RNA sequence: UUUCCUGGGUAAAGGUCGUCUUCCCAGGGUUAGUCGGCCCCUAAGGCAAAGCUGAAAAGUGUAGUCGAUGGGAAACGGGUUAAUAUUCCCGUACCUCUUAUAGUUUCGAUGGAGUGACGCAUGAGGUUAACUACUGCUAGGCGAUGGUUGUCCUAGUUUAAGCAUUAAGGCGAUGAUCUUAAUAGGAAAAUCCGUUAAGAGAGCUAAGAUGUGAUGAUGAGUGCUAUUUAGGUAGCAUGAAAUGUAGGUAGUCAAGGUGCCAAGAAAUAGCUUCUAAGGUUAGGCUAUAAGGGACCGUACCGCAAACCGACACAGGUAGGUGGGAUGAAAAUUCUAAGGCGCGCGAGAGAAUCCACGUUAAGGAACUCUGCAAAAUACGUACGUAACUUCGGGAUAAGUACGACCUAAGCAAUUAGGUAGCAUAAAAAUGGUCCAAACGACUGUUUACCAAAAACACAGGUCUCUGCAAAUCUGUAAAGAGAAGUAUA
RNA sequence: UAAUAGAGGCGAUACCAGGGGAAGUGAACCAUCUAAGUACCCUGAGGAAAAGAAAUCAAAGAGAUUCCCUUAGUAGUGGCGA
């Protein structure tokens, strides 16, 4: 992968770095039969209010129909056609062309190249890119795109540069260390993809200026001490207060250390040891 | 609507007179519910001649200001709108009733 | 100075038209009230503007 | 929304007057298969049987249906009226269908597929209306005052859609159309599967140019008649005078080429194509002649006394045209076409009020403060520091040249000569330097006394969140988060 | 789907039944209380609606419901305050 830096010809370029797209089959337009135009979200809901703040108008982008659920294509080999840039997620997307003529997108793992043959199912070889139920993957491998309920698709780790570590297997369950670091039990019949996700320099980037942050669809963040007490519990800044109060969210919920996970959730059985600060 | 509820009355105006004299065009007041086809059919039935084409216009209502018995504006009255038809005949054809 | 009444027409008819009034409960109450008072103009659709 | 045109009128309205008017009264005026709609399509979004949730009203929400500021069959030039014209007329075309004929041969969905289908920046190049430079051809003049029958003066020298010919360039030979053989999609297919074996295959797109359109129209003018303010203006007739060279812009080729990351609408429409239930003149296709164009808008104002501001208001109002000279330029000044001379005037110039011009000597002594003015200003060369994140600072600072004629020179400039107080002679067009405080910076903010040291910002840390995630709106369902997944 | 029958909306800025249900105020503050089941909203009807032929009253022996007169500003109730 790589990082491309810029000479400081303006005061904004001094700390701008972007990725280098050398590990990408470039010059590419998405497959017309898999992408549809879409709005930009900006965080408003059906009622029309703002439910999530500070999300705004970035660059217009199309949506690429990914496939995290390769189950209905077991035993059928496919060919890697190209590795493409996806604006809707960090990771890159590989275009698989199946032997029966159907084409699909997947998350591009780390180290695959055009022309590779990929296979899914219990019988598939243990090779980067293959999707197999957790039964069949040997202890000690690194997988990604983990399915949580049979038939749902990959709902666990998916972002650029991530991977999960298989630790142990027992009964109906497999112990998996997730990228946040907790150890969680997974039902042994769900599928997963072998190998890490490529594009691991995605977060080594220094954005460089407020404009690019606006391109990424992120409106400005207004602190709480810049508010008035009607606006935010921290307001009242007659000469730079610090809130005069233990830190809280704009709705009074404590924020420095308060644990917001429900105390009696349904999945508590399947969490061995939570993540670490 | 019979061909008699279609054609209301002709128009005798300077413009229509010169047009009729020069390019053989006849102008009628027709009913607001007519259209090109039954205006042509009505012309045929009434004057036994088939028109090459017909053009229709919608003339809007002219507004007037109404003043009291003493006289000062108290509202806006209006004339009735109507529909005007230009009818084009063949150079040998004529309509005699005029 | 650009000011308070930039006069559109699609906005006028869509927001304040007769169908927009009938479309909900409060609009029908508006119509009943104006009928009772005997207004000469019930909605902005009496101004023939499309 | 009649304010448009014609005729008539001056209660009122017009900041005066009025025979006048956008004011009043009467009549007249808006003609479409090609323009804009309607219609067939979808985006944002609205509504919504079912389902789900709520004392009620209703709230969510799938199949569906609406919703342009977008995508979709088709026309241009000239003339005419007191007012309408890509609508009427003249001239010449185009697109859709209904019936019928003659050659026919696979047609038929609200279903499938292809196309439709798109970003920013940036050259360079091909052609070109407008526009001036010249030659010529035509029409008028030869000028109250020195010189002007010449290398004179002024003006015109125009003309579309469509059609036929060919084709600058670009994309193309790593494959664009096609020909089989196999077939794990969802109706099942001879299409798409573009997936895979061959191997036959280079054409496609395209501004523009010529001819036709066009012996037509237009036409500076010229000729009869009336009229006249003695100047032209009203009609009627007539009138190739280059479809010349060279330069050349804004468009267009171009949704091009080449780079870059922030990775750049949808469509069930249109176009093309595939078939099921079905059809085998039942059609579909290629022509050919016959005729069918729906319904609505069309006047007038539209940088303004007709829209929005209570007004005949120093304000605002999208887009396309944007002549000539100067110039890098849409800057500045002047000016052609065209449109106007702001809907109270006329005398007098006292003080004074507001806005400007110039000034002896001194040059901030004024004042809270160099506030305001003055000054600097352009092009081409010379020469540029401390400091620095090595990019800057920097147009640093400072200074020279600039007109006219002749000669050199591709130009920029060089030399000589001439003239003035002044030669970037008008207007437009940086004042600079040193030091300190705050904020890094470009930006944002109290519409209507605060534009800043405030907010935002890239960057940093802490902490929460394992996905029917945290969080938020609601009594809920539900939605956002997210068609995302701790590099979030 | 078919067959019929009945509903939809308006009126009456009135009356009636049911559901939801305030506050300006008074208590010389105010929170219980008051205003008040009033204003308003919503769903239903009618010519009236509602109620109605005792598993009732209440210490008299009466005999469905409803509306007037009295009991009576009494019995009670109330930060026993208003």
Residue numbers in the entry:
A (entry chain AD): 1 to 277
B (entry chain AV): 1 to 98
C (entry chain Af): 1 to 50
Authors' text:
In this study, we report a cryo-EM structure for the 70S Bbu ribosome in its hibernating state solved at a resolution of 2.9 Å. The structure contains 58 resolved components: 3 ribosomal RNAs (23S, 5S, 16S), 1 tRNA in the E-site, 21 proteins in the small subunit - uS3 through bS22 and the bbHPF protein, and 33 proteins in the large subunit - uL1 through bL38. Of these, the existence of two previously unknown Bbu ribosomal proteins is revealed directly through their cryo-EM density: bS22 in the small subunit and bL38 in the large subunit. In our structure, we find bbHPF bound to the decoding center in the small subunit of the Bbu 70S monosome, thereby confirming the sequence-based expectation that it does play a role in 70S ribosome hibernation. Its binding site overlaps with the expected binding site for doxycycline suggesting that simultaneous binding of the two may not occur. An E-site tRNA was found interacting with the C-terminal end of bbHPF with no mRNA density near it. Maintenance of the bbHPF and E-site tRNA densities in all sub-classes of the 70S ribosome obtained through multiple 3D classifications suggest that bbHPF and E-site tRNA colocalize on the hibernating Bbu 70S ribosome and are not a combined density due to two separate bbHPF bound or E-site tRNA-bound Bbu 70S ribosome populations. In Bbu, there is no separate bL37 protein, but a N-terminal helical extension of uL30 occupies the same pocket by adopting a bent helical structure.
